[PDB]
Design a binder for these strands. Sequence first.
DNA 1: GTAATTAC
DNA 2: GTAATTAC
Length: 56
Amino acid sequence: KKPVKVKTPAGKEAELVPEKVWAMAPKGRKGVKIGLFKDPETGKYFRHKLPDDYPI
DNA sequence: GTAATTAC
DNA sequence: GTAATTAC
């Protein structure tokens, strides 16, 4: 639910709340966290790395 | 190559 | 079915 600074497919930076988040690694095993985002301007979906202590 | 996830 | 998301 924490907003994140991401670059959109339109090439603008924005502070968005990811629609869905997860860590890319087996459950309990640690890896990079990824968010699914949606661009308010283009409507396009995109993914972006999340900050490491991001609440999953 | 692949981890997890999913829009397309 | 594929590529997008980073990092190993």
